[PDB]
Design a protein around this ligand. Structure first.
Ligand SMILES: [Cu+]
Length: 99
């Protein structure tokens, strides 16, 4: 499933910013507008047993061009919060439910 980084109107949002996926389904974050963006998962808001380092970009890695992707597949069921490191303070955060 595809999640856009930035809305077409320049909003600092994941599109969609909440969704559910079955365990192990590929999630493709696709750079859209309003760069730079990246994608990390919050170590304080993922299921027990999840290592966010395996499913997160480096803070230093920034997506600066339209169409770049970051793909992950989440095996453990439960709720995950992801965020954009440059824009976390601007509310660029989302939630995926793995079921
Ligand atoms: Cu962002």
């Amino acid at each position: 499933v595809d999640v856009l980084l930035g809305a077409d109107d320049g909003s600092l949002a994941f599109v969609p910013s909440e969704f559910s996926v079955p365990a192990g389904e590929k999630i493709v974050f696709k750079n859209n507008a309003g760069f730079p963006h990246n994608v990390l998962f919050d170590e304080d808001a993922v299921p027990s047993g999840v290592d966010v380092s395996k499913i997160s970009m480096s803070e230093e890695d920034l997506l600066n061009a339209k169409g770049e992707t970051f793909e992950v597949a989440l095996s453990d069921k439960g709720e995950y919060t992801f965020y954009c490191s440059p824009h976390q303070g601007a509310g660029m955060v989302g939630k995926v439910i793995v079921n």
